[PDB]
Nucleic acid binder design. Structure first.
Ligand SMILES: [Mg+2]
Ligand SMILES: [Zn+2]
Ligand SMILES: [Zn+2]
Lengths: 149, 1335, 50, 73, 248
DNA sequence: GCCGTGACTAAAGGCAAAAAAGCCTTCTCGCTAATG
RNA sequence: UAGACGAACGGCGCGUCUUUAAACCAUGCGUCGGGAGCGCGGCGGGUUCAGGAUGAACGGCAAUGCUGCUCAGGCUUUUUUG
DNA sequence: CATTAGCGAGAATTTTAGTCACGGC
């Protein structure tokens, strides 16, 4: 631990029973600043209705969430990601839920080639920020490796 | 929605009514896709679809297809929720016997057939024949044969008799068993036989047969034929990661049973030999029994996990069972956790709250207001900007939490204070900030404990939270009247530092106009915080009819007390501050305010007390230091001197004069005396100090050592800690319990050698083990209190009965442990209070006794007062308000609709954690001597001897108040008399304790009549003493020819005739017992009633066993019927006795172990309910003899003595409540006009209310007797079967209720809790009163 | 769970986790080591006539 | 700015009946219309009702009378 | 920088804390002098005695150090490394007594009582009594506050009993324990217990309607039926025992 | 023989959290895959 | 490349074939979608009877279609905390 | 270029009370 200056005295009830009073000088010098290293895992299996694929092609996501990702869908090293953001973009297929002429025309105007996708991408847990330091990729043999790999 | 709950057995037709189809295929899933199998455990045709409103094959869809069975798929199409409703049924090839009724402790089928349980299992498991049809042969209806016996008997009688194997045979026997004929024969046989052994099982049999007869049941239904199937979803096959599936073990049990059934049914067509089919039948029976309950019959079936697979019965009972895990307490939404952290600036009614936690918690609340103001349009947009934390979001969030109460919860809770309400105030940070004064209520400390928060939703919830659960409304603990907002730690230390005068200080010796300028002096530094000065103050007295009286005076006081006086309210006088202001006083001081100036001034005053205490403690600067602990100089020297004594003592052990034990005791005493002396010396030198006064003289004022401020003020710790810090630790205990011979001569301020430190671990580790284990018994005990007291709740205003209990202050031969004033406070008198002068009424009957009346009670010095007691309240299914007395929570008469039982259970359970799991009589003080139940006589020498049993001593003061109480044996010595104003410290009683006297009664000449020499009595002139005397021998040498002969010494006067005892002409001879030496001889004078012979011979678990009344290992026997004592026929194993009443006959006889001690003899008169031997007393016979009012007094006395020994104050009325639930059950003595069996056991309330309406007509009552059923058995013997099931032992309770066909009416509280209905208590009491009125 | 007077030098008496399992997770001493059979033994200094 | 309800409780028989009548009146407040009889100070309807409890012109009987006279329109 | 609490000294009986603090105060005070003379960049000789003077203090100590062997650059490097405080080693059961600590502090320029005067920052006035001030070793435990913060308004739901999940990993709620339920029954609070046991735990109809109503403004619950109770019924109906409700 | 005693069996034994991991029967076969 | 089929229709996916509806599997491959009620009739499957492995009738439900009207993740195991 | 594996799918301690069994007079 650290070596600190201490004094035994009640101080306006802030040490009422066992609470400890700490000066801002402590955090100014970063005496008790600590480091944690959390690990996030993203799994891409081969479930029904097709396999699971990872890329940047995601719907209902802003351009800010894509500025931190490459074309392959893996966040760059050192990017200062925050809580609730996107780290790895994973998608899974479905059917197409039929056709409706009005929504079909709107989609054709928009330019959506195939809206058969469900978002299951890995997101940063809520309330935790930080900086990505490393990304390791495991791929089964006999499977093509993307430019990131 | 529903009125009551009905439970009974089931029938195959009823099962088919439940079911939708049959399951015939053990397969579950196709596993190619994820669709259910055909006729499998998840068959769509039998249970329902997979996804809402389209069949499996998908032919039918759209809204138009509701309620259609798609023929191709064969599946009814509807919403998927039906998967939680439909149930399947399996048609077993052969009948099977349900294990529960088979294998409970009382065997239902075994009792019904009057058959041993062991052989029924043999029959069912296909190993031994049993006759099912005797016919006209040499066999009985229920006879038993083996395979070779059947082989022999088959040829002798042919087909005339029939004997089979298995559940089919049992079912055939059950179906053919008549009921009415058995009932008639049982009724006729019950009156004929006279044998108590037969009576028990006879009554059980007739009760079971009556229950089956009176209910719509059939015995063969106890034998299963069709097996209902649990719905599919309740055993989910949730897909886990990858292709593997998570399979609940219950599905494995269904698969095994279906496989066995399919194999048996396919083997039945092959006409296989009986050997093969019997094995498969046994396999199927074992499988179904394990499915109903695993591990009951034999080894529990386990999978690859090597753990017992869960069964249906298992999933009900146990901590992991459905009830105690998902019915009483279930996980809830709108909650949060945090780390608790103290905050001083908060007011009493508000606690801090992190911004993030509140923002996420009140998400539903902000949504509505957000769209109300138009800042949002849809729900998804609202979610979008709320997670954007815009500026308006904080504004609206602050708007919606202006006065919205929240609930704070700490796990675990121990009493009513564990759940609190507060008005949150948003604060930055990530911790909950809580007001300090309430942390004592939580019994929590700010060392990283985690706090939990919930949020009420409805208007009713918020309103009741505001009205009840804020800390303002709860200042007095439900356990006792003492407050729970008692200041502690910093505030008490600082306030004590405020009020403590010094002989010399700056600013001493002037006069101040008032407190206002006095505060000015301290801030400017002109005067010290403490200085004895004169000052003018103002006092507002409410002595008139509730109006303040202002007066001005001058007081000699300190500056600090004047400073504190500013925040004191108007009513309190100034004398409440002139003292040293200790911790004990200030709390009581706060209490005094609650007795005068209401509630809100008290809470504001408490807040100001906190603020002033913190501020001036901070300005004080109280600090600990190494130099503070002053070790006495002489201490070391004393220790050296002590060694000398032990150095001598061991020599006496090495010299042979003193044994090891005596030397051990001497060493222990020497060390104890040395420790006490050094403790006294250290306390004396630490407590005092020397300082030069204003006149140049050294005056010894109270020491200002920091350790002494923490000690004396009581802020933290006790005198033991200070003793241990400076003085030597004293004697210490070994792990077994023995005391080490050499204690520790050093203290903590100095060093500790390795060996001395090692032995110190024994105490510490033992204490930690006690803390770790004692919580298990305590909390569990709490449950055993809650379940038996949950039913009780106040229902009516007044029962209108004057019966009650007599209560007197407790005296234990020394100081009175509890004065009468404290015990009676806040209760209601059962009778009118009479002055010691007769015909003068001090207090009327049916009048609540509050504090002002108690002053009148003590001013007149009332001896004792009889008060209303809820143990005998006349109300039904509750207790009337007046019997309960004063509510501690509100300070006034109890209300209607709140459950007393729950608060009583909490009050009796919370202090459990503070417990520990593992000659002559001298008058003490001044006063006269009074005795009651005393029948004394004067001996020859003029002394007073006693001829009674219950002779008690009293120390009557100048007024008549009781001071002392003692018990004396017969033939005691009295140095004084009754009513004499004697002096204290005088030996007034003396007698030989270690042996018993065989004293005579009256003077005369001893004549040894019927004196036998040779076998019974002989002149054993022992050479040790060489004294020739007649010695009566024991039963060893003598035999039945001489032991039965009793040598009786006929006590005669000088005339030689029988003594004319007053009242009785019976000669007062005393039969000589064994080993009773006749010390005196014939012809020598005898004193009046002189000795004939010197005849020779605790904690929480204790309280828990006392509540449920364990039978002691040595049950003291007491008298049963009042009458003249008579002996009985002996030598038939042990001794016997019979008591003859004056008028009625004497049919009572009982067997008494003759090896046991005795206290009663033939020539004596004993009242019923009086001791015969001595030892622990079973409360059952106490209640049977002395009545209800006696047993309630004993239990309360013992438990309160234990708690006072452990130093925790608990009100008595809480104990009584359990006692009222203790006597819930009674047993009929004689049926009379009632409609119950002679031996029937029916609850007292119901039997009394049923009797009352019958006797109101031209009929007579029914004689009964209240019994004693402990909590563990009283809880299960309750009408509400679900309530009993929730507590313990679900299997027996469910089976017993089912076979009896009981019917719960949801009268209890937990019943309404289970189904989510409003509780029949609290605010919900009014709603139910509306409900029952309309019904 | 209770500490025995023979633990001196072989089992620490003052370091152990608190809670449901106390006294069953006793830690090793500093100088202590294991014997050939598996018994606990401690170093000691031999004394010869003072 | 309400800290205790002792005066409100003593104005009524017990606390529970006060809670239920206050709940009824507050529900009457919130559902629509039925403005209070006392000036407000930016407070939610829960504490608004409690106020008319200590000034004492409202109770269970008075609320029932008002409801009856309004439904007898 | 840290304000401890004195009232935890007597009851806890951890008096070694005060002695440790007092020893720490002397150690840092020694470093300041070395810091002061290093600031003036005094000669190596002036160092050599002073460091020797501190080490020579003590009665019959087993630690004997000869600084004459050390070269000038070694002494300079050691003193530079020593400016943050002289490390003090103490055997578990052979530590120095109070007199030795007092003598060591006498080498410094601090009061022997080990209690210096202080001035409050807010008020600027000298406190009534001298207060203990020294240096202590502090440890930051592995229980972070944000690792325990957890709150759920509406997350997931169990498939068996239709109840909210448990555990921080799944946005779990709080388990309303049975003791808490009896605590609620102790008060007159019936509405709160009913709503908490019906409309927030499992009632599918209730919590769906309740969520809509609170958004729409209304604060009113509905009784419904706890689906956990229905499960038990089916469970009881799973056996040969028959159970059922009755007429409304 | 009938009340009394010993041996056998059943039931229950703090409450909340967090954090990690492991994992949800065993014997047999043809086309595709692994090995030489 | 295109076209056709794969428990009623259509779109897409997947498999087979090349002008044919077959082949595949077997609660007849997968996903999704049909504004609703009343009227017609029956896809589809079921019952009865007869005939001697086949045929006839039937309407409780109902496919594609048609005229008219009304409606908007559990358990287990550890470790730690209070 | 031939051989076998294999693999996914298919199936065969502590406390106490209650109750049954022996016994002895
Ligand atoms: Mg704590
Ligand atoms: Zn279908
Ligand atoms: Zn009564």
């Amino acid at each position: 631990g650290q070596n600190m200056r201490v004094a035994f005295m009640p101080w306006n009830g802030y040490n009422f029973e066992d609470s400890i009073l700490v000066s801002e000088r402590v955090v100014q010098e970063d005496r008790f600043t600590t480091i944690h290293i959390q690990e996030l895992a993203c799994v891409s299996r081969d479930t029904k209705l097709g396999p699971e694929e990872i890329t940047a092609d995601i719907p209902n996501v802003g351009e800010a969430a894509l500025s931190k990702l490459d074309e392959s869908g893996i966040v760059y090293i050192g990017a200062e990601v925050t809580g609730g953001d996107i780290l790895v973009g994973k998608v899974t297929p479905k059917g197409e839920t039929q056709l409706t002429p009005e929504e079909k025309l709107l989609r054709a105007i928009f330019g959506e080639k195939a809206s058969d996708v469900k978002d299951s991408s890995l997101r940063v847990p809520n309330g935790v920020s930080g900086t990505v330091i490393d990304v390791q990729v495991f791929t089964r043999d006999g499977v093509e490796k993307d430019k990131r790999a | 929605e529903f009125d009551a709950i009905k439970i009974a057995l089931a029938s195959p037709d009823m099962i088919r009514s439940w079911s939708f189809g049959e399951v015939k295929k053990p397969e579950t899933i196709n596993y190619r896709t994820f669709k259910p199998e055909r006729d499998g455990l998840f068959c769509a045709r039998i249970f329902g679809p997979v996804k809402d409103y389209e069949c499996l094959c998908g032919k039918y869809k759209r809204l138009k297809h509701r309620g259609v069975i798609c023929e191709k798929c064969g599946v009814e199409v509807t919403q998927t929720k039906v998967r939680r409703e439909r149930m399947g049924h399996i048609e077993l090839a052969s009948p099977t016997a349900h294990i529960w009724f088979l294998k409970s402790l009382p065997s239902r089928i075994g009792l019904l057939l009057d058959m041993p349980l062991r052989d029924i299992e043999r029959v069912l498991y296909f190993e031994s024949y049993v006759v099912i049809e005797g016919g006209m042969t040499n066999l009985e209806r229920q006879q038993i044969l083996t395979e070779e016996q059947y082989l022999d008997a088959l040829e002798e009688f042919g087909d005339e008799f029939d004997a089979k194997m298995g559940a089919e045979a049992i079912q055939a026997l059950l179906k053919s068993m008549d009921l009415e004929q058995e009932c008639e024969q049982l009724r006729e046989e019950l009156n004929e036989t006279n044998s108590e052994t037969k009576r028990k099982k006879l009554t059980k049999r007739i009760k079971l047969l009556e229950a089956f007869v009176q209910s719509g049941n059939k015995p063969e239904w106890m034998i299963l034929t069709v097996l209902p199937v649990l719905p599919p979803d309740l055993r989910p096959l949730v897909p886990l990661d990858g292709g593997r599936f998570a399979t609940s073990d219950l599905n494995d049990l269904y698969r095994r049973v279906i496989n066995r059934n399919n194999r048996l049914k396919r083997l039945l067509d092959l006409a296989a030999p009986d050997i093969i089919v019997r094995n498969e039948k046994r396999m199927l029976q074992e499988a179904v029994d394990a499915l109903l309950d695993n591990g009951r019959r034999g080894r529990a079936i386990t999978g690859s996990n090597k753990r017992p697979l869960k069964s249906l019965a298992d999933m009900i009972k146990g901590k992991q069972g459905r009830f105690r895990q998902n019915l009483l307490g279930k996980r809830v939404d709108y909650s949060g956790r945090s780390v608790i952290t103290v905050g001083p600036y908060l007011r009493l009614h508000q606690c801090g709250l992190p911004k993030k936690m509140a923002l996420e918690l009140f998400k539903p609340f902000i949504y509505g207001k957000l769209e109300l103001r138009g800042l949002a349009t849809t729900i998804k947009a609202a979610k979008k900007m709320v997670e954007r934390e815009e500026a308006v979001v904080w504004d609206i969030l602050d708007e919606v939490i202006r006065e919205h109460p929240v609930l704070l919860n700490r796990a675990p809770t121990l009493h009513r204070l564990g759940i609190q309400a507060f008005e949150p105030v948003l604060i930055e940070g990530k911790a909950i900030q809580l007001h300090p004064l309430v942390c004592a209520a939580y019994n929590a400390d700010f060392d990283g404990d985690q706090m939990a928060v919930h949020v009420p939703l409805t208007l009713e919830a918020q309103l009741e939270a505001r009205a009840l659960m804020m800390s303002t409304n709860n200042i007095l603990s439900p356990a006792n009247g003492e407050p729970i907002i008692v200041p502690s730690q910093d505030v008490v230390l600082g306030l004590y530092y405020m009020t403590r005068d010094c002989v010399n200080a700056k600013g001493e010796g002037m006069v101040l106009t008032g407190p206002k300028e006095a505060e000015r002096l301290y801030r400017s530094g002109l005067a010290s915080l403490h200085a004895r000065v004169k000052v003018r103050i103002t006092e507002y007295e409410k002595d008139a009819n509730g109006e303040l009286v202002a007066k001005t005076s001058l007081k000699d006081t300190t500056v600090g007390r004047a400073i504190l006086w500013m925040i004191v309210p108007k009513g309190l006088p100034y004398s409440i501050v002139n003292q040293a202001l200790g911790k004990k006083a200030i709390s009581k001081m706060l209490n005094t305010c609650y007795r005068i100036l209401g509630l809100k001034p008290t809470v504001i005053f408490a807040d100001q007390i906190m603020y002033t205490g913190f501020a001036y403690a901070a300005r004080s600067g109280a600090s600990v230091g190494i130099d503070d602990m002053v070790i006495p100089e002489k201490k070391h020297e004393i220790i050296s001197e002590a060694e000398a004594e032990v150095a001598e003592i061991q020599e006496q052990f090495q010299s042979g004069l003193v044994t090891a034990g005596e030397r051990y005791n001497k060493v222990i005493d020497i060390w104890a005396a040395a420790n006490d002396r050094v403790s006294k010396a250290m306390m004396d030198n630490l407590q005092t100090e020397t300082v030069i006064n204003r006149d140049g003289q050294e005056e010894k004022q109270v020491s200002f050592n920091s350790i002494y401020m923490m000690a004396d003020s009581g802020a933290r710790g006790s005198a033991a800690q200070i003793r241990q810090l400076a003085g030597m630790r004293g004697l210490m205990a070994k792990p077994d319990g023995s005391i080490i011979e050499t204690p520790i001569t050093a203290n903590f301020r100095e060093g500790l050698n390795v060996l001395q430190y090692f032995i110190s671990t024994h105490g510490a580790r033992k204490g930690l083990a006690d803390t770790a284990l004692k919580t298990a018994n305590s909390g569990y005990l709490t449950r055993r209190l809650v379940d038996v007291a949950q039913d009780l709740v106040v229902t009516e205003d007044d029962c209108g009965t004057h019966e009650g209990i007599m209560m007197t202050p407790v005296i234990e031969g020394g100081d009175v442990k509890e004065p009468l004033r404290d015990r009676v406070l806040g209760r209601v008198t059962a009778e009118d209070v009479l002055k010691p002068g007769t015909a003068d009424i001090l207090v009327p009957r049916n009048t609540l006794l509050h504090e002002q009346w108690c002053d009148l009670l003590e001013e007149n010095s009332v001896d004792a007062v009889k008060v209303r007691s809820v143990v005998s309240c006349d109300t039904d299914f509750g207790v009337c308000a007046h019997c309960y007395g004063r509510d501690l929570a509100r300070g006034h008469i109890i209300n209607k609709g709140e459950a007393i039982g729950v608060i009583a259970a909490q009050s009796i359970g919370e202090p459990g954690t503070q417990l520990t799991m593992r000659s002559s009589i001298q008058v003490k003080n001044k006063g006269s001597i009074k005795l009651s139940n005393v029948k004394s006589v004067v001996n020859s020498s003029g002394k007073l001897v006693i001829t009674s049993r219950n002779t008690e001593l009293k120390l009557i003061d100048e007024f008549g108040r009781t001071k002392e109480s003692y018990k004396v044996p017969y033939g005691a010595v009295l140095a004084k008399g009754d009513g004499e104003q004697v002096a204290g410290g005088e030996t007034v009683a003396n007698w030989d304790p270690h042996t018993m006297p065989v004293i005579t009664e009256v003077s005369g000449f001893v004549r040894f009549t019927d004196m036998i020499d040779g076998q019974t009595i002989t002149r054993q002139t022992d050479e040790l003493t060489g004294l020739s005397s007649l010695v009566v021998l024991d039963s060893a040498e003598r035999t039945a020819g001489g032991k039965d002969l009793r040598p009786a010494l006929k006590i005669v006067d000088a005339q030689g005739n029988d003594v004319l005892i007053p009242g009785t002409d019976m000669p007062a001879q005393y039969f000589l017992p064994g080993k009773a030496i006749v010390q005196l001889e014939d012809g020598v004078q005898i004193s009046s009633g002189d000795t004939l012979a010197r005849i020779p011979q605790g904690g929480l678990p204790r309280v828990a066993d006392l509540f449920e009344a364990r039978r002691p290992k040595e049950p003291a026997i007491l008298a049963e019927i009042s009458g003249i004592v008579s002996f009985g026929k002996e030598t038939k194993g042990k001794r016997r006795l019979v008591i003859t009443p004056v008028d009625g006959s004497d049919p009572y006889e009982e067997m008494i172990p003759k090896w046991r001690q005795l206290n009663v003899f033939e020539g004596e008169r004993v009242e019923r309910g009086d001791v015969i031997s001595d030892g622990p007393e079973a409360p059952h016979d106490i209640l049977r003899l002395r009545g209800v009012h006696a047993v309630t007094r004993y239990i309360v006395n013992e438990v309160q003595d234990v708690y006072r020994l452990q130093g925790v104050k608990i009100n008595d009325k809480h104990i009584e409540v359990i006692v009222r639930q203790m006597l819930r059950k009674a047993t009929i003595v004689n049926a009379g006009s009632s409609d119950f069996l002679e031996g029937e056991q029916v609850e007292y309330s119901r039997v009394k209310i049923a009797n009352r309406e019958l006797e109101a007509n031209g009929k007579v009552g029914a004689t009964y007797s209240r019994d004693l059923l402990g909590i563990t058995k009283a809880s299960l013997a309750t009408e509400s079967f679900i309530s009993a099931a929730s507590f313990q032992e679900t299997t027996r309770v469910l089976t017993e209720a089912a076979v009896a066909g009981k019917r719960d009416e949801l009268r209890g509280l937990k019943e309404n809790v289970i189904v989510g209905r409003l509780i029949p208590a609290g605010t919900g009491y009014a709603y139910h009163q509306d409900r029952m009125r309309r019904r | 769970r209770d500490v025995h007077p023979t633990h001196y030098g072989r089992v620490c008496p003052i370091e152990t986790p608190e809670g449901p399992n106390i006294g069953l997770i006793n830690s090793l001493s500093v100088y202590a080591q294991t014997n050939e059979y598996g018994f606990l033994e401690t170093p000691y200094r031999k004394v010869t006539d003072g | 700015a309400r800290v205790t309800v002792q005066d409100a409780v003593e104005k009524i028989g017990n606390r529970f009946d006060l809670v239920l009548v206050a709940a009824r009146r507050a529900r009457q407040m919130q559902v629509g219309g039925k403005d209070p009889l006392v000036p407000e100070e930016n407070d939610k309807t829960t504490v608004i009702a409690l106020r008319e409890i200590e000034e004492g012109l409202i109770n269970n009987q008075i609320l029932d009378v008002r409801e009856r006279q309004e439904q007898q329109e | 920088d840290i304000v401890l609490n004195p009232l935890g000294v007597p009851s806890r009986m951890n008096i070694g804390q005060i002695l440790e603090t007092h020893l720490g105060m002397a150690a840092k005070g020694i470093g300041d002098k070395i810091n002061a003379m290093l600031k003036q960049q005094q000669e190596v000789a002036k160092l050599r005695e002073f460091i020797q003077r501190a080490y020579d203090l003590g009665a019959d100590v087993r630690q004997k150090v000869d600084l004459s062997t050390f070269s000038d650059e070694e002494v300079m490097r050691l003193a530079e490394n020593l400016r943050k405080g002289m490390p003090i080693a103490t055997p578990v059961f052979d530590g120095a007594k109070e007199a030795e600590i007092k003598e060591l502090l006498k080498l410094g320029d601090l009061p022997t009582s080990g209690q210096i005067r202080l001035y409050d920052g807010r008020t600027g006035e000298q406190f009534e009594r001298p207060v203990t001030v020294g240096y202590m070793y502090m440890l930051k435990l592995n229980h972070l506050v944000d690792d325990k913060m957890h709150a759920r308004s509406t997350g997931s739901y169990s498939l068996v009993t239709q109840q909210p999940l448990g555990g921080k990993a799944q946005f779990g709620g709080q388990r309303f324990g049975e003791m808490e339920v009896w605590a609620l029954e102790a008060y007159g609070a019936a509405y709160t217990l009913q709503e908490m046991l019906t409309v927030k735990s499992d009632d599918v109809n209730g919590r769906t309607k309740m969520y809509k109503n609170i958004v729409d403004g209304n604060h009113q619950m509905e009784p419904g039926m706890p689906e956990s109770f229905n499960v038990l019924l089916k469970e009881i109906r799973s056996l040969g025992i028959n159970i059922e409700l009755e007429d409304e």
